[PDB]
Ligand binder design. Structure first.
Ligand SMILES: Cn1c2c(cc(Nc3ccc(C(=O)N4CCOCC4)cn3)c1=O)-c1cccc(-n3ncc4cc(C(C)(C)C)cc(F)c4c3=O)c1C[C@H](O)C2
Length: 263
């Protein structure tokens, strides 16, 4: 529990599923992001119980939870500040002029975080470049893992809804609501595609409904030009129709390291 007397509110960072997010300082020294949770957007009591366990997730490629302010409304969630913002918009700026080793290193940063969550049996359920952040050193970290469970908006939580992450979801989630470790593995392969495509929308010429149809029939995202055959094999292994045939994050990490040594 953070005392809100120790917070300042300095700049607006944007709006997400739970409303406004601000940049500020904690104890007049530490940069933070402050999620000011909008009324009616979150299952707050359930989150508060879960914050207790989320306080114990700590890994250098996971955005760090610093605390919460819950003796009040709105409630606040206080996290590590990531100066370069979301990975999706970062990938789309042509000025960075990324080398392919930098793109693989972004995939590796996210896979390390995901291997740590897998080790804790903890699902993200919305892994995508819009939900990863980049710090001032260009390190990518995974954000808002596990928070999908507390979203009140039916347009986000229904697999037929307008905000559901259709293009990052495997066929068994779309058809059957079958969530597992393997549904995050599928999203991870889509996130590698987003990285190697410099932030294009997956299935860029299709709607969500058409994408759901395409992937249940076996078709997959094409190889981005910047991906080698070896990088494409890694992302494509995440898309096996049989969930049990998809790798684990531990296996993907070893794959990514072997390709970095190769390239
Ligand atoms: C830390 N942190 C979070 C943010 C943003 C952060 N940092 C920055 C830093 C710089 C800039 C900037 O303006 N520029 C200008 C151009 O050059 C690049 C830099 C913007 N943001 C940050 O450190 C955030 C904000 C809004 C919304 C969200 N957001 N995103 C996904 C999301 C997803 C979900 C789910 C549950 C639907 C999955 C739930 C959510 F509440 C959110 C959510 O609040 C976040 C990200 C982070 O939460 C805070």
């Amino acid at each position: 529990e953070i005392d809100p007397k120790d917070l300042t509110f300095l700049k607006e960072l944007g709006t997400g599923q739970f409303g406004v997010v601000k940049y500020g300082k904690w104890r007049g020294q530490y940069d933070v992001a402050i999620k000011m949770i909008k009324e009616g957007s979150m299952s707050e009591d359930e989150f508060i119980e879960e914050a207790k366990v989320m306080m114990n997730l700590s890994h250098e490629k996971l955005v760090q939870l610093y605390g919460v302010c819950t003796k009040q409304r709105p409630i606040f969630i206080i996290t590590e500040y990531m100066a370069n913002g979301c990975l999706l918009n970062y990938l789309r700026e042509a000025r960075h002029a990324f080398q392919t080793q930098q793109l693989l290193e972004m995939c590796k940063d996210v896979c390390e975080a995901m291997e740590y969550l897998e080790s804790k049996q903890f699902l993200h359920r919305d892994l995508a470049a819009r939900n990863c952040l980049v710090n001032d050193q260009g390190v990518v970290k995974v954000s808002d893992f596990g928070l999908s469970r507390y979203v009140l908006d039916d347009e986000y939580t229904s697999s037929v809804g307008s905000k559901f992450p259709v293009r990052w979801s495997p066929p068994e989630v779309l058809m059957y609501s079958k969530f597992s470790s393997k549904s995050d593995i599928w999203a991870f392969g889509v996130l590698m595609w987003e990285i190697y495509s410099l932030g294009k929308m997956p299935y860029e010429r299709f709607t969500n409904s058409e994408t759901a149809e395409h992937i249940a029939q076996g078709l997959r995202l094409y190889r981005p030009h910047l991906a080698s055959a070896a990088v494409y094999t890694i992302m494509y292994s995440c898309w096996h129709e049989k969930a049990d045939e998809r790798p684990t994050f531990k296996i993907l990490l070893s794959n990514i390291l072997d390709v970095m040594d190769e390239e």
